[PDB]
C-alpha cells in the first residue's frame, strides 16, 4: 500500500466573550467586520492585542469554521496564529493583531520608504511560510499581497485560509468544483481545470512578489478577468518591474511557466532570495534606497501573541 494519514491533534480554543475589549473597528466590507481589541484571560496578568473577525447564515458559519480548522492546524513564525474562536450569534475568529495591516496596503502607503532590504526579506519570509505550509501538505489557493500581514516591517506572516485545502499523504492535487476565485493570481491550470497544487501556489507567489516589486500595482490592471486565460495561453506574462534586475524577474517568470513541475519549489525560492538579501542593491535598483527606513490599552502587562504560548 501507500502512505497513510496521522491524527490531527490540534487544539481548538473556545474563548469567553467577556475576555475581549473591542477597542475599535479595523475594517469591514466583503468579509464581515474586523475589530481591534485585547484578550484578557481570567487569572494570568496578561493583555494580548488581537483582531476579532465577527463575520449570520449557516453558510457563513460553516465557512468561518472551516477556516479556524486550518488556522488551528498550523504553527509557524510566518503563518498568522489563531488564538481561538468565540461562539456567539455568529462565529468570531480571534487572531494575533498585526498593527500594520496587510502588506499590499503597507507598501502602497510607504512607496517612498520601501528599501530593497525589506522587500527581499519579505520575499524570503513569505517563501518560508509557504514552504512550511507545503510540509503540512496544505494548498493555500489564495496567496496574494492582500493576504500577507505585517507584525512589523521586519516580520510578516501569511493569512486568510478561507480557501485552503489539506491534501492527503500522497495526493498531488486538489480539484475544486466552482465558485468565485481570484483569477489574476491563479495558475493557468487552476483557471482551465480547477486544479490546485503547491506549484499553483508558487504561481500565486510570483504574482505576490510582482505586486511587492511594483510597490502595489494591480496585476493586468484594466484587463478583464475573463480575458486573462487567453493572454496566458498566448504566452504573455506580467511586465518586468522597473526596480528589478533580470535576476529577480527571472525568478518571477519561472513561477509562471505553463509546466507546474518546472516552476521552482518554495525551498529553492527561500534559498534564492536569501542569497540576494545579502547584497540587496545588486538585485533591486531603487532610487534613494540608501536613506529608506521603516518605523516599528495600557502598556504594562501587554504581551504579543508570539510570547503567549498556550499549549
Amino acid at each position: 500500500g501507500a502512505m497513510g494519514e496521522a491524527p490531527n491533534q490540534a487544539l481548538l480554543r473556545i474563548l469567553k466573550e467577556t475576555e475581549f475589549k473591542k477597542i475599535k473597528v479595523l475594517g469591514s466590507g466583503a468579509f464581515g467586520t474586523v475589530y481591534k481589541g485585547l484578550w484578557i484571560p481570567e487569572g494570568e496578568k496578561v493583555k494580548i492585542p488581537v483582531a476579532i473577525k465577527e463575520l449570520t447564515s449557516p453558510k457563513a458559519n460553516k465557512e468561518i469554521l472551516d477556516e479556524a480548522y486550518v488556522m488551528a492546524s498550523v504553527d509557524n513564525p510566518h503563518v498568522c496564529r489563531l488564538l481561538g474562536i468565540c461562539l456567539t450569534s455568529t462565529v468570531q475568529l480571534i487572531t494575533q493583531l498585526m498593527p500594520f495591516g496587510c502588506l499590499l496596503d503597507y507598501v502602497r502607503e510607504h512607496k517612498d520608504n520601501i528599501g530593497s532590504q525589506y522587500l527581499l526579506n519579505w520575499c524570503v519570509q513569505i517563501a518560508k511560510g509557504m514552504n512550511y505550509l507545503e510540509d503540512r501538505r496544505l494548498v493555500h489557493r489564495d496567496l496574494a499581497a492582500r493576504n500577507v500581514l505585517v507584525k512589523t516591517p521586519q516580520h510578516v506572516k501569511i493569512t486568510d485560509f478561507g480557501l485552503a485545502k489539506l491534501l492527503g499523504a500522497e495526493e498531488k492535487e486538489y480539484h475544486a468544483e466552482g465558485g468565485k476565485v481570484p483569477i489574476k493570481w491563479m495558475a493557468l491550470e487552476s483557471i482551465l481545470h480547477r486544479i490546485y497544487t503547491h506549484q499553483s501556489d508558487v504561481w500565486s507567489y510570483g504574482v505576490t512578489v510582482w505586486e511587492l516589486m511594483t510597490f502595489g500595482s494591480k496585476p493586468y490592471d484594466g484587463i478583464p478577468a475573463s480575458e486573462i486565460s487567453s493572454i496566458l495561453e498566448k504566452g504573455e506574462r506580467l511586465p518586468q518591474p522597473p526596480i528589478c534586475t533580470i535576476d529577480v524577474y527571472m525568478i518571477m517568470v519561472k513561477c509562471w511557466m505553463i509546466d507546474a513541475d518546472s516552476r521552482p519549489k518554495f525551498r529553492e525560492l527561500i534559498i534564492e532570495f536569501s542569497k540576494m538579501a545579502r547584497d540587496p542593491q545588486r538585485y533591486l535598483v531603487i532610487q534613494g534606497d540608501e536613506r529608506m527606513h521603516l518605523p516599528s490599552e495600557d502598556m504594562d502587562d501587554v504581551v504579543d501573541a508570539d510570547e503567549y504560548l498556550i499549549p
Binding site: R146, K180, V181, P182, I183, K184, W185, M186, S190, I191, R194, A225, S226
Partner: peptide
C-alpha cells in the same frame, strides 16, 4: 479583487 472562472 478578481473573481469568477
Amino acid at each position: 479583487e478578481i473573481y469568477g472562472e
